[PDB]
């Protein structure tokens, strides 16, 4: 619509003008918050340079390439309807272009010879964010909010989302969260009493907020609530606080809930940048959900002791399955909520006839009485590691029981096995009244 | 009525624990044939699994659950851990420490002995070294041969090598366990049937000062204990201070402070000096070897320091010269502690140099740093009524500086 027009600064810009083979010798100046915000912008500039640069590299010698004249692909991409790509003209020049699509594919121009797209150009979120963030800068200098920022450092099931849902005034405040799944769950839980108080305006994903800032809706809020703010670059949090025009912001965070990872190759994100600067730090170390054994595990991953209000002591168990095929709804029904680590395993169980299956990642923040966790892939699964955020999440959803069914030995089998062996009297030491 | 405790994880080493206890009881009775006070033996289970042990032959016995129930989770175990067993052992270790602390108060603790692999040794060591020096502390360990500092620390904890992994009573363990138990009983019975000391910190580069001071002190009628300032030395001295073994300190070499600030291999912890000030014992402090941070070998030297002035003392160790900015930091740490003093303290500073390497015509010589250290110290302590700052016209190794340090000690601790 009118969004493509808002990104005109990027349309047909030379690929070279957006590429920066450096961003390692960058020296920031000013207050810590300013440096973090500057650094956040550069992480976006660096992520875009890499995306544009790889598209050009592909043209020079997922990563799809289109022949303009024949309207047929030389290399078919995995995704569809990419929002942008790099164009190679007949003079062999490289320009970034915001793409349009019709019944027959990409709408092209006569002077375009080939067009390259990739997983990174599927969406123009980086450009969208740059556009928004750069308009807030006066000569590269971002404005820092005078609002008080309170950080609530918590653990699984301590009440991060519950507190937000309990304290927010849906008519004046804003709740920002990373990921659509989380945003949808928050709205659903907020609207569960029967009335819709949580909408697309007072509950938004971080990406949507950054990308569509100004496009309308509403911009000024009295208080800002961020659920899982430690999943974001510190400079991003600084921008969100300022952009919400709030007088106070509550950043609910969790150091083990998939913390913000640089990801950008050779991009600098020093330890002093990774630490959020707030006016007050609050701590939550009592889980109101997890059993005492899962709590023992949590104590191992968090600074500070973790206590539990729950009376449940031991709740985990597992089972090694010989024949992956034996795991079917008739042979062995799976109690409660059925979860898997990968999509492939998820599809498998669904085709086998199991009802309502989701991946661990798809149920972040959710609670269940009983969980049946399943691994059908005997091949290596990277996200299943002793210190993996997915494992942490996978062990902290249930209030009553968790059973892990796997076709192969892995770090999770060890964790569950060790938890089953610990003394129950030791486990009692985590108990608190509440 | 003297009592000793035999401790171990009964869920995995029940028979060995029993055997040891049995041998300790028998040995205690034999060796004390001279008789008198009877020594009681209590067996303590520190198992952390759910497997329960309710007795150990005919011994007074404390189950795993009773050790834990006397304890409340504390700061010692609030950090992060590698696995479930590691955290369980850490909590049990502190619970054991509490149990022994109560035993040592409302009971006559005569000694403690235990056995274990790396995990059991880790569990027992921590609790055992919390007891006063002198009280027999013995552990038959499968890891007595290797790095033992994390187990023994500055204590008198004794690790008897198990020779073979601890697994059942066999011809080998019978002998090893028997000797260890007989040794413990010997220590216990021998202990039952039966001068003002100054602590001084030292380094090779400040030995001239230390020996002069030591000789002077002995002449004044004092007894001395010299500690190599390798990080552990400073702590060893301070633990002895709170232990009542040291009545005065001449902290000549505070170099451990440098490694703590910069990040060397022979660093002190953030608690340096605390023990001395809290005991309110006379303290004369100086800046010996504060011109060098320890590393070695060169290759080891953190990247950001290879551009610094290094001195290869030998193959395994290299000394880095401290800059002028780092010294001010040293002063801040020292002063920050000294400004908490509630008893007399004297700081003696040598104008000429702080080490044999920080002397006219020497590698580390830098009067710009020496001068800075002096000024920062005077200024930070200027408003401390309990502290006097003396700036003497000598090099730390001059015989007159040594004798000046002693004079200062005598005036805050007259005789
Ligand atoms: N539908 C429900 N009925 C009753 N209790 C619930 C329900 N949903 C959640 N809870 C409880 O609410 C408490 C905290 O829920 P949350 O605040 O969502 O967990 P959290 O602090 O956000 O940690 P995460 O996001 O799941 S890692 C736990 O004790 C849950 O068991
Ligand atoms: N998963 C677990 N949770 C709680 N306690 C455990 C667990 N696994 C083992 N333990 C206990 O930890 C204690 C030490 O186990 P041990 O096998 O005796 O270790 P160790 O022989 O002393 O030293 P190493 O590490 O085996 S060389 C025993 O009480 C075990 O029962
Ligand atoms: Mg939540
Ligand atoms: Mg912890």
Short mmCIF file of N, CA, C and O and ligand atoms in Angstrom, two decimals, chain A residues 160-162 185 189 227-228 289 365, ligand 3:
data_model
loop_
_atom_site.label_atom_id
_atom_site.label_comp_id
_atom_site.label_asym_id
_atom_site.label_seq_id
_atom_site.Cartn_x
_atom_site.Cartn_y
_atom_site.Cartn_z
N UNK A 160 5.75 -13.67 35.48
CA UNK A 160 6.15 -12.55 34.63
C UNK A 160 4.96 -12.04 33.82
O UNK A 160 4.64 -10.85 33.84
N UNK A 161 4.30 -12.94 33.12
CA UNK A 161 3.17 -12.59 32.28
C UNK A 161 1.94 -12.34 33.14
O UNK A 161 1.13 -11.46 32.84
N UNK A 162 1.82 -13.12 34.21
CA UNK A 162 0.70 -12.98 35.12
C UNK A 162 0.68 -11.57 35.70
O UNK A 162 -0.37 -10.94 35.78
N UNK A 185 -0.93 -15.19 22.59
CA UNK A 185 -1.24 -15.82 23.86
C UNK A 185 -1.61 -14.75 24.89
O UNK A 185 -2.55 -14.94 25.66
N UNK A 189 -5.20 -14.59 26.83
CA UNK A 189 -5.33 -14.69 28.28
C UNK A 189 -5.97 -13.44 28.87
O UNK A 189 -6.70 -13.50 29.86
N UNK A 227 7.22 -8.02 27.91
CA UNK A 227 7.32 -9.38 28.43
C UNK A 227 8.51 -10.06 27.74
O UNK A 227 8.53 -10.17 26.52
N UNK A 228 9.48 -10.50 28.53
CA UNK A 228 10.69 -11.14 28.01
C UNK A 228 11.61 -10.14 27.31
O UNK A 228 12.09 -10.38 26.20
N UNK A 289 4.63 -22.22 39.50
CA UNK A 289 4.17 -23.32 38.66
C UNK A 289 4.85 -24.66 38.86
O UNK A 289 4.20 -25.67 39.17
N UNK A 365 5.78 -19.84 27.32
CA UNK A 365 4.86 -19.08 28.15
C UNK A 365 3.58 -19.79 28.56
O UNK A 365 2.86 -19.31 29.42
MG1 LIG C 3 5.42 -15.61 30.52
#
